Amino acid sequence: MISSVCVSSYRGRKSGNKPPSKTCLKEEMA
């Protein structure tokens, strides 16, 4: 695997669409 932090370094490494301003992930979990 790739040594990363809590996240698995997956394509959705945008921070995830939080409850407000869902623009971080904006890529179906990728």
Swiss-Prot record:
Effect on the protein upon substituting S21A: Decreased inhibition of channel closure by PKC
Mutation effect (S15D): Slightly decreased rate of channel inactivation. Loss of channel inactivation
Result of changing S15A: Decreased inhibition of channel closure by PKC
Reported effect, S8A: Decreased inhibition of channel closure by PKC. Inhibition of channel closure is nearly abolished
Record region (Disordered): 1-24
Protein role: Voltage-gated potassium channel that opens in response to the voltage difference across the membrane, forming a potassium-selective channel through which potassium ions pass in accordance with their electrochemical gradient. The channel displays rapid activation and inactivation kinetics.
Family: Belongs to the potassium channel family. C (Shaw) (TC 1.A.1.2) subfamily. Kv3.4/KCNC4 sub-subfamily.
Name under which the protein is recorded: Voltage-gated potassium channel KCNC4
Location of this fragment in the whole protein: 1 to 30 of 635
